[PDB]
Symmetry: C3
Subunit: 145 residues, 3 copies
């Protein structure tokens, strides 16, 4: 009967879909359904398993593992980014301390430059007044002879 065959194909088809969802291993019974509706009862070899889309894991196991990978990869990158941001924060505070110390260096350099200029002007005046006094003395001596 054609109803006997249809029930047989349906069992085999439901069985195979179940293995796609829940997986299979070497030795486990697998059914191959022909275009002619001919059902072949085989046993999954190491080849069938190794060269399967998910290597006999099944859709449920793969999706569960993928969910684990997605979350693990997010935790891992979130912590790498938090590390880099902390390094950036420490470089910012150090660069701010460097700029502050340079501003102090400039203020000290400017006070040193100004003191040098004042000393130079004070020496120039003193040298001019000394020259004038020595010249006056020489003239009093050059006259007294």
């Amino acid at each position: 009967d054609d109803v006997k065959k249809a029930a047989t194909v349906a069992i085999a088809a439901a069985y195979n879909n179940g293995q796609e969802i829940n997986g299979f291993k070497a030795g486990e019974t697998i059914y191959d359904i022909d275009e002619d509706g001919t059902i072949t009862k085989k046993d999954a070899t190491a080849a069938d398993v190794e060269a399967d889309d998910f290597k006999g894991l099944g859709l449920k196991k793969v999706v569960t593992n993928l969910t684990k990978t997605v979350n693990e990869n997010k935790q891992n990158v979130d912590a790498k980014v938090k590390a880099a941001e902390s390094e950036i924060e420490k470089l910012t505070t150090k660069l701010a301390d460097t700029d502050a110390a340079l501003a102090d260096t400039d203020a000290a350099l400017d006070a040193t430059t100004n003191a040098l200029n004042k000393l130079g002007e004070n020496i120039t005046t003193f040298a001019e007044e000394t020259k004038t006094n020595i010249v006056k003395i020489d003239e009093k001596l050059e006259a007294a002879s």
Copy 2:
């Protein structure tokens, strides 16, 4: 008949696979198939739902949500990395401005050091010529008794 039984198992199995793909909720009819091929018509409890791999969501809904998570996690990290890189770009420009200001400080310090050395050489000569002149006058006075 064994064909009656086979059709019944096939319906129950196809129903069960459909729930794995499309999901189930508390109250919804669930079928438990025995190794003996005995089909039990139960009703999904809150336990069956809460302690299910995807909590009755089904493979389609989970994979759809996972695709949403993957893309959302990529947008989120891409923007955190773009933020960190902008902070790095601003630290680079500021450090380059700091090094430039320090190079100017060094040039100004070298000019101050050089002017200080020249001034020191200039007073040494003046001080030497003053000593010579005072000593000559002292001799002119010591002679004139």
Copy 3:
């Protein structure tokens, strides 16, 4: 018979589940099962395909592609983070070189300030000893005048 119908529904249901796992395309036979258990043999249109959850790809193909996306996105971000960290490492070494050069500038500025102060102290003494000497000579001349 009710067993004839049950076998027919089961075939159609198993066929549909298979399409959800392995996918479909426009033209491919699709079965629509009624609540009444009435099976309708249709042909997937461009609408059925375009407005499907995974657009007829099937669960296997979507999960395989998603695995590719997850790994590609991890490789891509791992390299962007490795790039940023290398930039951070180079900024650290340059900032350390800047701080070292500033410490040298300060030491040189401190030596210049100290040499300026000593010079100012030496000129003051010389200037004081010169006034004393000119003043003594001026007195030796002023006395030698009052005769």
